[PDB]
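Hello everyone,

My group is preparing for a crystallization screen and wants a predicted model to guide construct design. The compound we'll soak is chloride ion. Before spending weeks at the bench, it would help to have a computed complex in hand. I've included the protein sequence and the ligand's SMILES below. Output in structure-token form would be ideal because that's what our pipeline reads.
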Amino acid sequence: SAPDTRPAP
Amino acid sequence: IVVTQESALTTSPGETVTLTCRSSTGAVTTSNYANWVQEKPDHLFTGLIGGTNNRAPGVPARFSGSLIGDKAALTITGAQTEDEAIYFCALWYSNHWVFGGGTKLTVLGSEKSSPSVTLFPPSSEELETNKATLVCTITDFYPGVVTVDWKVDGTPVTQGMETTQPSKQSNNKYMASSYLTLTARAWERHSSYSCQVTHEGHTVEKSLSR
Amino acid sequence: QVQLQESGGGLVQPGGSMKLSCVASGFTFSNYWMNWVRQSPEKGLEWVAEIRLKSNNYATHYAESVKGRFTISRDDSKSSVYLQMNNLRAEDTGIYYCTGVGQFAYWGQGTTVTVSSAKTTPPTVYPLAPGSMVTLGCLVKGYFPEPVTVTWNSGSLASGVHTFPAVLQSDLYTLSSSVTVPSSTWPSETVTCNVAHPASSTKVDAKIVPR
Ligand SMILES: [Cl-]
Ligand SMILES: [Cl-]
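Reply:
Good plan to model first. Here are the tokens for the complex, ready for your pipeline.
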């Protein structure tokens, strides 16, 4: 399971 | 799990450097989403790389994350003087992170300078308390990395010594201090005491004869 | 401009409890997970806790060393993340940072949390005499808590001063300072260090005399 991979602002 | 990094590296500006990061459990893969974080003087932290090779926003293009063999790696191409700093890597293990010990990076931004060492004997006032502390101050060195070694009658001490992490002086050279704590009995029993500071392969030493 | 700003740190005795707060601005805090990471001398960086999004039910994970004693939580209404620490131990001492975004791009300034059972203690100050230019110093031994302020000749000796970091030895802090003066002025003239320890409300002078 992955960490927070959402793109940064 | 233990994450290991190089303790320090030195480079002239304009050259490329690679720092690595290994895991004690096995190969570092993309599943460890390796991060690289920079610490500049004053506990200023900033993330450089996330998810192995995704550079955080605003971070200079000269910084790149990658995987080399079984390790995660950070490469700085054409390192600049502003890059002298400590670099930490962090690895993800399914549901937790483990940080590495940090690599101190020197980007030679001035001429090298040897440490100025001063060793002080225990005061009479302190001795009355049956304690003896020898103080070794260490200043004006660049690179800011030194190892301190204490000796008593020529023999290496492994107990009672405590050294502080170099810290930058206004002139961007570094300073540090070390302490040897002895009972008064141990202090009176020996004649020779020495603080030895190795900086870039050259040892600067001060000694006390008692 | 993004900004993370921690709060709530302080001195606490073992068994103690405190809550840290971190407020984010300059970006959509609600969109990213947040973590607490602490920095200690004996341990470098240590990840402590993470908290995911509202849509993850505010799910969390904790480092084993903290599980059962610490609780991370968030309030997106306030753009804030928090750390409730209970049953604090001296090993929890360190600077605590909230940090997040891909995966640690943003870090606050940090807030210091000291866990110590030590009582306030004024330093015993000791002159350090030498065993063209001469270096004298002062040992400030066995005080608690920090800080301490060290001057030389009331601050008239400004140039040539070096004050070093406190070391913790015996639950108590020790630091040193040194001045370099022309040997033509010592010991013919007086060199005294002035040490103040606000906590003990003390201010001591120590003259450096030749051995
Ligand atoms: Cl999970
Ligand atoms: Cl006079």
